[PDB]
Every structure is written in structure tokens, then in C-alpha cells.
Amino acid sequence: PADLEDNWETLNDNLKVIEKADNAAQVKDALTKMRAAALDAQKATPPKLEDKSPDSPEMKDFRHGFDILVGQIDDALKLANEGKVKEAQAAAEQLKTTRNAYIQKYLTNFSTPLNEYEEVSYESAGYTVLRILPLVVLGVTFVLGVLGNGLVIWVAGFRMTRTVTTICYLNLALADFSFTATLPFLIVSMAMGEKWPFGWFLCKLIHIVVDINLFGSVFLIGFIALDRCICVLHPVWAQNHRTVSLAMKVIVGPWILALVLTLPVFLFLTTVTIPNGDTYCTFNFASWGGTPEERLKVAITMLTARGIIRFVIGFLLPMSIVAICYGLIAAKIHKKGMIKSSRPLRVLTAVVASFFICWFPFQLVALLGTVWLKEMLFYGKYKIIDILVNPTSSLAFFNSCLNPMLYVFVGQDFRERLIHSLPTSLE
Amino acid sequence: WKYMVX
Ligand SMILES: CC(C)CCC[C@@H](C)[C@H]1CC[C@H]2[C@@H]3CC=C4C[C@@H](O)CC[C@]4(C)[C@H]3CC[C@]12C
Predict the structure, then answer these.
(1) What is the tally of structural domains in chain A?
(2) Cα–Cα distance measured from residue A329 to residue A238, given in angstroms and rounded to the nearest whole number
């Protein structure tokens, strides 16, 4: 067992002490601490992790790089024991160059998504059908989403009467429609092993439309829950204050919040080109500001902040609202008689179950991937997290075509209004 | 690690 993080923390910390010089034994004290850290860093090599065997063309080369690292440490160490602090610091500059090679080697392999279509570890027929499965789910979500939410845009948007309810369903329909309309670009990207055959402009346009509407979808779901909660708990306040004019103002909130949380996509998402002929639409971590050492710490904190916001703001906030609001509604109906209970109980327990079943797996996988970010960076561990992204993503994406039946067409006025709008159709 | 929506 060994921790590469504390090793490279010791290596970078002592490299700064060597630049301070100020003495001769101070360079020797730092280089000795660097040599101990480089030895442990050689012990933390993933030799057993990737084909455990002696004398290998790819396993004995990552261990040979530390020999050149330890070799350069001795070069600066022999010149330090001779009192010459100038030749010792000059040899430490080459020691920084190889350190920048390992940091870039960690960042490039990290920003490169693992192409599970060519890896031998996922060659079995089981993994082969589990890669087509999220593609099929996105396929049926594309057709059902653009039609299901398209009908709501037409019916509840132009055929029904402008109420607070129809405005809520229209915004929810415009969110899921704009999202599901980008599924063809994401299904061919997932089918090519996370590659991006589209331009740099589409890499930023599509993933912004995705993050804005998906954030909007869950935020509006919680907004509908809040509005439904106030009607049942405060019916007198609703008829005297719940107006269409007020709903026009307070509903821009969820969209502004979805727009701000998408700024990281607008600024740091771009098309990167791997050394061979492969293009990926990801965060270009190996092309940010500061020293290469600084690019390592800002990459973890950025993805940590992104994983926290995805879980807390993107799930804990709407899930708590949905659970509490419909829970307070279930208590208000349990109080008085069954006058308001015109909708079956399967309707009340579906908006809280469909939102949880669809989002919790993906939110759980993305959350585990955030707490194991460093384990994936220094060791490439927890590859099951990457494997489960697409399957759990498609499940959450499928919620964008279930909301029409859960919220809109579950009522009586919407379903019959759609029938009379289409001429000569089956009932 | 892969790019995740959210
Ligand atoms: C933090 C996440 C994970 C869970 C949510 C915890 C907090 C915010 C929740 C849990 C139960 C909630 C309460 C449940 C019921 C009521 C009664 C209602 O008339 C006013 C709000 C009030 C008092 C809620 C306030 C918010 C509340 C205290």
C-alpha cells in the first residue's frame, strides 16, 4: 500500500525548498526526502493492476521512468554533497521537467474517457448487450419525448386556457422537448465510445442545452410540487394571490438557476484531440492556467464542486421538495374527507417514485465517482463507475418522456382536449 | 472518469 498523492505532495514541496537554496545541507535534506518519496511512488506503480508479470513492454516501462527520476535525484545529490549549491539547483530544473511529464501523463489519461468498446475486459457478450441497451433507451426516449412533450406544447400551450397549471406544464414541456431533441447527437456519440464527430460549436451548444434543460426539468418538477402544495394547504390564499401574473415572474427563477449552474460547461467544455486520430468533447484539463502542478489541484476541486452541485442542488434540493410537498398533500387529504381526492392515489405516489427511480441511480453513480476522484486519477481504480454512466444516464434521461403522462395527461381535462383536437382518431 | 451531465 502507498499513496501517490502524498508522494507527489512531498516531491513538489521539496522542489520549492531546493529553489529557496539558502544553504547546502538544505538542498541535501530536500533531495533525500525526494528520494524516499520517489521510492514509495515506485512501489505504488499499478503493476499488479495492469497485467502483473516480470519484464513487460508496458508494465516495466512505468517503473523504469522512476529509475530515471531517482537517477536525476542522485545527479543533483552528488553535486549537493560537494558544497556546490548552484549545480544542485540547476539539476533540479531537469527534475521538474520529468515531474511535469508525470503530471501531464496523469491529466491526459484522466480527461480521456475509457473506450469500453475496444477494451478486452468488457468484451463478453453481456457487456456487449449492456452498451446497446442505453442506446435503445435513448432511442425510445427520443421518439416518445419529442412527441409526448410536443403534444403538451401544442395542447396545454395553445389549446387549453392560460392558467397557472398550463404555464407550469408548458415550461416543463419546453425543457424536456429541448433536451430530448439533442438525443440523436448523444446516441451516436455514445455509440462511438464517447467520441464527438461533431464540431467544436456543437460540443458546446448541445451539452449546454442538455445541462440547462435537465437542470430545468428537475427544478420545474420541484416548482410544480410547491405550487400543488400551496393549493391544497392554503386554498383561500390561492384564489386571492396565486395568479398567472405572479406565476410568470417566479417561474423564471428555476431557469436562471439552471443557467448559472451551466456556466462551467460554457467556459471549460471544448473538443480535445488525443495523440492519435480521436476527438473528445470533454474538459481540457491539460490546457488550463498555472503550473502543471496547479493544473492537478484545480482539476479535482472543479470536478468535486461539479459532483457536489449535481448531487445537492440537482437532486437533494428537488427530491426533498417533491417528497415533502406531496407528503403534506397526502396528510391534508387524510385530515378532511375525500372531496379533493378526485385523482387516484396511484397518481400521488407516482410523481415521487418516477423521479426517484429515474434519478437516484445516476445521482448515486455520479456521487460515488466524485468521492473516488483521486482514486481514479492516481490509480485508474473504480472503472465500474464509468461503465455505469451510460446505463444510469439513459434511465434519468427516460424521465423526460414520462413527465407528460405523470403530470399532464394524468388529468381528465387534458386527455379529452387532445382527442377532439385530432380529427378522426381512435378513442 | 467520463464527462457527466449535471
Ligand atoms: C436536507 C434534506 C436531505 C432533507 C430535508 C430536511 C428538512 C429541510 C425538512 C425535513 C422535514 C421538513 C418539514 C416537514 C413539514 C413541515 C410542515 C409545514 O407546514 C412547514 C414546513 C415543514 C416544517 C418542513 C420544513 C423542512 C423540513 C424540516
Answers:
(1) 1
(2) 15
| Position A404 in a domain | yes
Q: What resolution in angstroms does the PDB record give?
A: 2.8
Q: Is A320 in the pocket of ligand 1 (CB under 6 A)?
A: yes
Return the CATH number at A229: 1.20.1070.10
User: What is the C-alpha R_g of chain B?
Assistant: 5
Domain assignment present for residue A16? The answer is: no
Q: Residue whose CA is closest, atom 5 of ligand 1? A: A320
First to last CA, chain B: 15
- The answer to whether A91 and A85 are in contact (CB under 8 A) is no
Cα distance from A267 to chain B (closest Cα, Å)?
14
Asked, for residue A35, whether it belongs to a domain, the answer is no
Give SS3 for A280: strand
A2 closest CA partner among A45, A31, A51, A48: A45
Yes or no: say if A189 and A280 are a contact pair by the CB < 8 Å rule.
Answer: no
Long-range contacts of A174-178 (CB under 8 A, 24+ apart): A174/A149, A175/A213, A175/A214, A175/A216, A175/A217, A175/A220, A175/A400, A176/A145, A176/A148, A176/A149, A176/A213, A176/A217, A176/A400, A176/A401, A176/A403, A176/A404, A177/A145, A177/A146, A177/A149, A177/A150, A177/A153, A178/A209, A178/A212, A178/A213
Nearest CA to ligand 1 atom 11: A324
Method of elucidation? X-ray
* Residue A225 domain boundaries: 120-421
Q: Examine residue A384 and state whether it is found in any structural domain, yes or no.
A: yes
- For residue A14, the number of C-alpha atoms closer than 13 Å in the C-beta half-sphere is 24
